[model samples]
Target: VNPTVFFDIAVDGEPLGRVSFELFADKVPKTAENFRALSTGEKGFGYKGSCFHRIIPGFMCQGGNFTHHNGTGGKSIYGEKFEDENFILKHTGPGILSMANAGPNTNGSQFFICTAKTEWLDGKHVVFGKVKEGMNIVEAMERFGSRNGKTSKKITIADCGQLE
Candidate 1:
């Protein structure tokens, strides 16, 4: 069975809200497994205290670069980046979750949550999951952190397990 993960974020140390993600493990096994392992702290290098390091209003909010606390560093569960999964989903609108990479086959621990339509990113990134609920929180994060850097908020995984 596939799994669902819920992330609870805080802006400037205050509660923001929860964002639920429905992972497509079956379709994108490697990508989904990487996320699940990192998120649940099962891999020792989790996303529990990472910040939304990059935020662009009309683009996406990026995070999970836990190693460097910035976009430059992060490793997958395999201790190195992996190849991209088959392009199965489109970045047609907001609240889509996709892997962030430097280029092809560089998917690591970084990911993005789209705040608005990002059709241009369709063929560039792997869309393995989407926001199941709480897009308002995604917008709130965007509004707060898009440019001023005031939005490098902390993200915590409330729970992560199979959805049944």
Candidate 2:
């Protein structure tokens, strides 16, 4: 069985709710494993206090830069970066979770969750997971993100961990 992870979300410092995700370990074990360990902070750091640095309402929200806390930095468990596992998954609908990279084979610790179908992201980004719950909070998070994906307010991961 695959692992499920969660993010307890907050907007502008107030607790909003929780968002759960089911990692496609069956399809991409390495990518899913990285996300799993990162969430557990087993390597000494994780997404406990990271911000959803880039958010485009009705599109997607990007984050996981616990190091830079914006969109500039993060590292995979293997190293500073890792290659694309595969493109077995597609951005077929909302709530899709995939790595947000700088370019080809540059996947770090960063990832994003889709709020709507994104055909343009397929093959370029690795789709390894999806939101299992709390699409409402993601929608709420997007409310703080206006046109051009600019931040209207800070939506943060108040806490994050694995659900076993």
What is the C-alpha local distance difference test score of each model?
A: 0.78, 0.89
Tell me which residue pairs clash in candidate 1: none
Find the candidate with the highest TM-score and give its number.
2
lDDT by residue (tens digit), candidate 2, 20-47: 9999999999999999988888887767
Candidate 1 segments exceeding 4 Å error: 68-72, 147-164
| For model 2, the run of ten residues with the poorest summed lDDT | 66-75
Q: What is the lDDT of residue 157 in candidate 2?
A: 87
